[PDB]
Design a protein around this ligand. Structure first.
Ligand SMILES: Nc1ncnc2c1ncn2[C@@H]1O[C@H](COP(=O)(O)OP(=O)(O)O)[C@@H](O)[C@H]1O
Ligand SMILES: [Mg+2]
Ligand code: NA
Ligand code: NA
Ligand code: NA
Length: 387
């Protein structure tokens, strides 16, 4: 029954929001970024979280009250960019807090000395170009990191399918900075996107696209008293282009998959890492393991695994949904399904904070039931009532 406050010091404050200053490889909707601020609320425990006002309205309290939870009293709210950045500065300077960023912000928002985890180390651990440095040089697909001036001549040497990823120090997540190419038409689109991002891109990772049979996020935790602890694994729900939609629970993770992730966790810990980490480990048809993405931080599958004690173990689906336009029907359909027992609410972004149906409401949840077929029928019926 681990919680995040077990892993971070008493002076740490947490923000899971992307900065209002985006980069071409992490450009989620402003409302998607605000919706993310409340994702880890149920596992934060004593860790204070910076949350958009619309992410902690009475709508969230109602959904939590059904599952017998409260909205944590230790939240700091913001409602725009200026108050968000001012809050972060005031917390570090006046409250003498240390800020844990899921995604780094620029130094003019907060100097690196106020980061809860060493910024240089955090950036290096979460740098996709530097993955082989953390895997003892194993588990990676056929890959090469090339400077952007050599990308055109190098890409011609590769067969489809392939993946192109930024190879610099910019934050990325959720599939916002991955270009999976299955044919020349995909590559043509990727080349244009790279060209429009010339200002922020100095190098590119070229990687063979693995024909995976499984896609795990294998999670671990570390603190000086706990040691290195395996948290479990989740299957990733990502579309054909790597865009992240959610997670499913797992039943029998192979031993060598867990051990590949643990060795990576040990390498990070030996460099000073602490907290939660999650590693994307693919498995092909011949049972080879591929480390394609290291997340030395929490992510979405962390809530699923840390809340496993409250969920049906037969089948779980972590997912997010948008309002179809009518936020009132959206919320009331959700609240109805939460009371039916097989829908665990995690986060709610109340679009009616901006006025009646002016912004789409957003809902993060875990479907959980005895069988996959019964769970998916429950989700399909929920989606039908939303039209
Ligand atoms: N080399 C690869 N082979 C096969 N699939 C890949 C590869 N790289 C990425 N993907 C797919 O794209 C998704 C997102 O890419 P990832 O490197 O995890 O970026 P992010 O930082 O957005 O999670 C993965 O979950 C996986 O489904
Ligand atoms: Mg990933
Ligand atoms: Na990631
Ligand atoms: Na996928
Ligand atoms: Na990552």
């Amino acid at each position: 029954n681990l919680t995040l406050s077990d892993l971070y010091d008493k002076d740490v404050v947490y923000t899971s929001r992307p900065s209002y200053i985006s980069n071409p490889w992490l450009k989620p909707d402003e409302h998607q970024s605000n919706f993310l601020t409340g994702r880890e609320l149920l596992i934060a425990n004593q860790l204070p979280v910076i949350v958009h006002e619309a992410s902690a309205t009475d709508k969230l309290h109602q959904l939590f009250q059904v599952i017998g939870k409260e909205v944590p009293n230790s939240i700091y709210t913001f409602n725009n960019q200026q108050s968000y950045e001012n809050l972060i500065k005031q917390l570090a300077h006046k409250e003498n807090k240390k800020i844990y960023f899921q995604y780094i912000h620029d130094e003019t928002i907060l100097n690196q000395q106020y980061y809860a985890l060493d910024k240089t180390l955090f950036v290096a651990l979460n740098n996709k170009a530097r993955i082989p440095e953390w895997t003892n040089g194993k588990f990676l697909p056929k890959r090469k990191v090339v400077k952007i001036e050599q990308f055109e001549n190098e890409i011609k040497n590769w067969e489809f399918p392939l993946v192109i990823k930024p190879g610099d120090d910019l934050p990325t997540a959720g599939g916002y900075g991955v270009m999976i190419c299955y044919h020349d038409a995909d590559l043509q689109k990727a080349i244009t996107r790279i060209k429009e991002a010339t200002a922020e891109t100095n190098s590119l990772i070229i990687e063979q696209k693995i024909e995976e049979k499984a896609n795990y996020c294998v999670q671990f935790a570390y603190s000086e008293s706990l040691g290195i602890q395996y948290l479990g694994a989740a299957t990733q729900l990502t579309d054909k282009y790597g865009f992240y939609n959610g997670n499913e629970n797992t039943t029998n993770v192979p031993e060598h998959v867990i051990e590949a992730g643990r060795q990576i966790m040990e390498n990070g810990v030996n460099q000073g890492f602490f907290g939660v980490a999650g590693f994307d480990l693919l498995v092909d048809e011949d049972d080879n393991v591929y480390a394609i993405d290291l997340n030395f931080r929490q992510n979405g599958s962390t809530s699923m695994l840390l809340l496993a004690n409250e969920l049906n173990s037969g089948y779980q689906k972590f997912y997010s949904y948008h309002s179809k336009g009518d936020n009132t029907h959206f919320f009331n359909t959700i609240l109805k399904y939460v009371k039916e027992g097989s829908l665990y609410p995690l986060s709610y972004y109340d679009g009616d904070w901006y006025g009646e149906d002016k912004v789409k409401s957003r809902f993060g949840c875990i479907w959980h039931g005895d069988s996959k077929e019964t769970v998916l029928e429950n989700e399909r019926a929920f989606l039908a009532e939303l039209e």
